[PDB]
Amino acid sequence: LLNVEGVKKTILHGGTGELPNFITGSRVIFHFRTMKCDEERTVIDDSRQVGQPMHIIIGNMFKLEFWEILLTSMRVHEVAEFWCDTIHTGVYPILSRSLRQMAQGKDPTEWHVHTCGLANMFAYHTLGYEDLDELQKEPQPLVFVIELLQVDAPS
C-alpha cells in the first residue's frame, strides 16, 4: 500500500517477484474490472467480459499518469484492489469511452473516429453510453481490481 492520497490499495493475490522494470516505454498488460462502491458493487467495465486484456505503454516514468501510478505499484500476476476517491474518478467516463471504442477495433488514430467522436459529444452531450453518462453527472469514488499479467521493455 504505497501512499499517494485519495487512494486505498488492498492486495488480494500477492503475485510473484521483484517489481518489474517499469521503464518509460515499457508495455503494461493487464486485466481490470471497475466498480462503483454501492451495495451491488455494480460493474461498469471488465476486460474479461470483453474477452481480452488491456494494454498501455509508459509515457514517462517521472511524470506518471494516474492509471500508471496504480499499475506501477504491482508485481506480475498480482491482483490488487484500488479504491479511488472522487477526485481521481472524474475522467473515468471519458477513459472508458476511449476503451470501449478500442474494444471494437478502432483507434483515435483513425481520425474519423476522433473527429466524428467529438462531433457526437458536442452535438448530443453524451459519451455514448447511459451508464457512463449517469456516472458523469453523479461524481463518485470507484474501485478498480487489476490483474497485471505482463510488462515488456521497449522495441
Curated annotation (Swiss-Prot):
Tissue specificity comment: Highly expressed in retina. Specifically localized to the developing photoreceptor layer and within the photoreceptors of the adult retina.
Assembly and oligomerization: Interacts with NUB1.
GO MF annotations, alphabetized: farnesylated protein binding; peptidyl-prolyl cis-trans isomerase activity; unfolded protein binding
Cellular localization per UniProt: Cytoplasm; Nucleus
Function (record text): May be important in protein trafficking and/or protein folding and stabilization.
Protein name: Aryl-hydrocarbon-interacting protein-like 1
Tagged with keyword Nucleus: yes
Medical condition linked: Leber congenital amaurosis 4: A severe dystrophy of the retina, typically becoming evident in the first years of life. Visual function is usually poor and often accompanied by nystagmus, sluggish or near-absent pupillary responses, photophobia, high hyperopia and keratoconus.
Part of the whole protein covered: 6 to 160 of 384
Biological-process GO terms, alphabetical: apoptotic process; negative regulation of apoptotic process; phototransduction, visible light; protein farnesylation; regulation of opsin-mediated signaling pathway; retina homeostasis; visual perception
GO CC aspect terms: cytoplasm; cytosol; nuclear speck; nucleoplasm; nucleus; photoreceptor inner segment
Keywords per UniProt: Cytoplasm, Disease variant, Leber congenital amaurosis, Nucleus, Repeat, Sensory transduction, TPR repeat, Vision
Residue intervals of the PPIase FKBP-type domain: 48-140
Record flagged with keyword Cytoplasm: yes
Main location: cytoplasm
